[PDB]
Amino acid sequence: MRIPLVGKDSIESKDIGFTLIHEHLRVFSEAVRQQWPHLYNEDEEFRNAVNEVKRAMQFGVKTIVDPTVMGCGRDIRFMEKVVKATGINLVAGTGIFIFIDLPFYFLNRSIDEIADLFIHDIKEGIQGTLNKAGFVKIAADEPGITKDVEKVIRAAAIANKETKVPIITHSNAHNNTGLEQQRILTEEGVDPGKILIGHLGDTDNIDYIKKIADKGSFIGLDRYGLDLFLPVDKRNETTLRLIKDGYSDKIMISHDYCCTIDVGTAKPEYKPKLAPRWSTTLIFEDTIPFLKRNGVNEEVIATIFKENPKKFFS
Amino acid sequence: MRIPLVGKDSIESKDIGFTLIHEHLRVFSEAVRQQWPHLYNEDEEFRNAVNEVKRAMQFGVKTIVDPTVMGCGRDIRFMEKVVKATGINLVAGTGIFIFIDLPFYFLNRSIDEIADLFIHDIKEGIQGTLNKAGFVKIAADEPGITKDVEKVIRAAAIANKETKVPIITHSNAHNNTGLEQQRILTEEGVDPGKILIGHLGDTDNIDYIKKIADKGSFIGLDRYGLDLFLPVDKRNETTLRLIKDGYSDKIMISHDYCCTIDVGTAKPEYKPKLAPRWSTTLIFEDTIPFLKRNGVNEEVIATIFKENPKKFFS
Ligand SMILES: [Co+2]
Ligand SMILES: [Co+2]
Ligand SMILES: [Fe+3]
Ligand SMILES: [Fe+3]
């Protein structure tokens, strides 16, 4: 019994089953929600997330990994409410989601102070609860590896060395931050097989994607349906190409869907053009039927959505 | 009764009395307190706040203006507990305190949606209470007038137009950021006499200070006791030189004291050499006696601590 579950007992990795490795029940800015509660609706958010999870379960999904952490509104109590309503296996995480600078709390604070916050969440529990974190989540985007972004990466390595949970990342697919996160994490002694470099499905540069996978880490083909980053047809033929070239040992697939997100870019006005078919079940409606009538047999699908998450968490 | 107060009925500006224009009951990072509650202690914070305010009332302070807003952990229920335990007149505000970028919630959101939040706090109330904001707080520091900093400035100008509350600023004394804020706000139509340009007391360069005051705005000599910005001795010389030259009608004086502050810079082991005598009552022991034994009579003292707060809030 290694992997902690929100609102359930920890399970052994052989029981994870068909997993969606990267999906968000709810996303918000902590400071904004605290200071202006009138902009949010708890009841509409709960019922949206319940409705999305149940439909993914009708397609056979057993476990959702939810990498919502500090900076994006991680609420451990909301999550265990959604678990009770649906019965999904739900893995929560710890970490810090920043692109530039840490919050003011962290001025004059060591990398060890930050890693201790991740270890508290893993070993004791999240937000005063006994639900424990099952991975660490870190991020870098267009601003590159800044000094505080580097501090967070090095803090994740300390927490993994001490607890053995794996690491999921957010990177920008067109600026090498994915390769850099992998380089810093492995220089500091993390097993590359415990790193999922994220948002690599945002590019059709097969060479860049393959260079990360050849250094031993999982590649996140994890934003199916966010057309503004890359359209579905283009992601599909990249997934096909990687599978034909033999890379199914490192492929993980998901949607990065947010059953609610408070960001202004994700208004319903903009949905028709930026992300029309985006949801937690799009891969069942499109990608997997696309792969199979393109010669990919069901043993490969099992590897990607079951065997690979099992190894990540083993 | 144009000034609203926390936990009390509003008062006419002529009844504000002896005022400390810039002090903080509590400062923390919204995301950190939300994600790691084990780092904070609500009972100790409450007690530290009650004791400092009681001490300021001992010396005759009637009114405290607390410019804690989003980004610095404003909590109106906490402020109203302190009020009921002490009897102080406490003015809370609205605003956004950032140095670089806004939280992700604001991406693809206009200046008008930002002004709308300030106005909600002024006209309807704060955090779901009927305590209303009496001014708008904005900040800029070392990174200068960035894109998102400029947005918040203009948003504060629009809230001023609709509601007439004044504007307090945080600036860096060696950046010209204080001069930029005054230029931008006055270009969008704000009465220069409703603007307090903050943290000018951190410098001894009197030509820059007189520059902002000459163009009609109050000047904040508001960090008495934070020696790392400037020792008390130099602050007294600058304050006297300004009064001796007729700028008493523009001077406001305070400490920027934080009864509790969570940033690592302010941890207690740093206090002996960063801010030894920092408190809400340092000016009663040092600064006010200094001024009186150098030719400043009680009418000028009353101008700075009673007449100027009154005119600012009129
Ligand atoms: Co991401
Ligand atoms: Co300030
Ligand atoms: Fe995500
Ligand atoms: Fe302040």
From Swiss-Prot, chains A, B:
Residues given in the record as Co(2+) binding sites: 137, 170, 199
Catalyzed reaction equations: An aryl dialkyl phosphate + H2O = dialkyl phosphate + an aryl alcohol
PROSITE patterns assigned to the protein according to its UniProt record, in alphabetical order: PHOSPHOTRIESTERASE_1 (PS01322), PHOSPHOTRIESTERASE_2 (PS51347)
Regulation: Inactivated by EDTA and o-phenanthroline.
Entry binding sites for Fe cation: 22, 24, 137, 256
Activity's dependence on pH: Optimum pH is 7.0-9.0.
Name by which UniProt lists this protein: Aryldialkylphosphatase
Source organism superkingdom: Archaea
Cofactor(s) this protein requires: Co(2+); Fe cation
Gene3D superfamilies linked to this entry: Metal-dependent hydrolases
Thermal dependence of function as given in the entry: Thermostable.
Quaternary organization: Homodimer.
